């Protein structure tokens, strides 16, 4: 329940997004009270393992840069045709 | 349904064509219309 | 069953009326209101949302227990003199959602008698 | 209140033998044999019935 995240810089284009998805990463957001809205990237395999161990509706204390945030999953965009995840929204419950 | 030509008594002319249906209004119909010979509204009547 | 209120119906009718009715600083609106006992009159220029003169049956300058109708007559005379100082020319009479009968008719006829140009 | 077309109804003396139900009116204007003062001083035409003597339920 100790995921990591790397912050996406500004203006990610289509090409770099799909390169990131060709790699094992996935884009995500973090919003909610306690922090402002931030756009990040996450490893798909590690996220899947965390979900396997904690459950769909569970809490994760993931690391964003310097700090850590307790967070729950709100929604996720998924590609059923190649069975991979393509986006994930994180909600800070605090 | 037919056409009808109205006629004044003092303006001495007929420049008002209207329409009516016989079975609902068979009688001759009369109205007040402005014929400009006399410069007033006068009683025109079907003919 | 339920009893309806009267003023919202009045306001619907008044909104339907005031679609070709407005003040322009030379034909201002003469708005009227009556609840159950008194009557109120207000001159308005609707181009700016501004009012110019006001009068009422409970204004101490005119307040008695005569008829509920001669009171409206006095209100008409009063607002007429109040507008006689300025903008006593042809105006537009806004009856609200009320008939032109009784108190409103008396008020309007008084306003006409007191020198207004409508 | 539209006068002319309504019927004629008036508070006749509906003094029944049972409770004196003098709370009726209409065109049953018989000869004024009895004009009770507590009731209407009018026709006694509603003078007796089975109104308040023995009901099916409240006999």
């Amino acid at each position: 329940a100790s995921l990591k995240s790397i912050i996406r810089q500004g203006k990610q284009t289509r090409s770099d997004l799909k390169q990131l998805r060709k790699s094992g990463k996935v884009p995500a957001v973090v919003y909610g009270y306690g922090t402002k809205n931030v756009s990040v990237k996450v490893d798909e395999v590690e996220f899947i393992k965390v979900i396997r161990e904690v459950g769909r509706n569970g809490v994760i204390e993931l690391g964003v840069g310097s700090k850590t945030i307790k967070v729950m999953v709100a929604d996720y965009q998924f590609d059923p045709l190649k069975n991979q995840i393509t986006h994930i929204d994180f909600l800070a419950i605090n | 349904r037919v056409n009808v030509t109205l006629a004044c008594t003092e303006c001495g002319d007929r420049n008002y064509i209207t329409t009516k249906n016989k079975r609902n209004n068979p009688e001759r119909i009369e109205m007040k219309k402005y014929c400009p010979r006399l410069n007033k509204y006068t009683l025109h009547r079907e003919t | 069953i339920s009893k309806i209120d009267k003023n919202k119906v009045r306001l619907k009718r008044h909104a339907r009326v005031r679609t070709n009715l407005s003040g322009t600083a030379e034909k201002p609106r003469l708005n009227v209101y009556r609840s159950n006992k008194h009557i109120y009159a207000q001159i308005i220029d609707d181009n700016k949302g501004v009012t110019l003169a006001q009068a009422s049956s409970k204004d101490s300058d005119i307040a008695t227990t005569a008829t509920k109708v001669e009171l409206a007559t006095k209100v008409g005379e009063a607002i007429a003199k109040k507008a006689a100082d300025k903008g006593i020319k042809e105006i537009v009479f806004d009856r609200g959602g009320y008939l032109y009968h009784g108190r409103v008719k008396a008020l309007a006829e008084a306003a006409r008698e007191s020198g207004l140009e409508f | 209140m539209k006068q002319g077309i309504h019927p004629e109804y008036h508070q006749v003396i509906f003094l029944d033998t049972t409770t004196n139900f003098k709370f009726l009116s209409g065109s049953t204007k018989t000869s004024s044999e009895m004009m009770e003062w507590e009731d209407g001083k009018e026709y006694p035409v509603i003078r007796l019935d089975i109104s308040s003597d023995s009901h099916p339920f409240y006999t």
């Binding site: 899947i48 979900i51 396997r52 769909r56 998924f78 059923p80 045709l81 995840i85 | - | - | -």
Partner: protein, 137 residues
């Protein structure tokens, strides 16, 4: 044999085949399902054949849902005659499916039985298919 009881317009434009599935891409009623992988029309007889072949292998066992209905009629001139003297007569009814679309769902039966039955159904269809389950995670 599946078709609507009535339609406002009998003659229609033939649909579009470009793109991906607008909806119906997840199993909702059952445990297992057959997802499409290519694009084509399905003609309301193919559905019947697949349903029969998939039913008899389960032997009045589990339950089957058909997530597809042919709403759209297609026309045909009977004999190859001259072009252009009006549009032809209705010949059948079709549904259009794009990649991602679920076609059949099954429940109340084992996984291997579901796989074999849906294979038998797939061999009766004009489109490539793929066995899938309920989504989790």
């Amino acid at each position: 044999m599946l078709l609507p009881k009535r339609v406002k317009y009998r003659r229609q434009h033939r649909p579009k085949t470009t793109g991906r599935s607008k909806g119906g891409n997840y199993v909702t009623f059952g445990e297992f399902g057959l997802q499409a992988t290519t694009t084509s029309w399905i003609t309301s007889r193919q559905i019947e054949s697949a349903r029969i072949a998939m039913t008899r292998y389960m032997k009045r066992g589990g339950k089957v849902w058909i997530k597809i209905f042919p709403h759209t009629p297609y026309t045909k001139k009977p004999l190859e005659v001259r072009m252009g003297a009006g549009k032809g007569a209705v010949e059948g009814w079709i549904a259009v499916v794009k990649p991602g679309r679920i076609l059949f769902e099954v429940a109340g039966v084992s996984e291997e039985v579901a796989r074999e039955a849906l294979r038998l159904a797939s061999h009766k269809l004009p489109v490539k298919t793929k066995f899938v389950k309920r989504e989790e995670l």
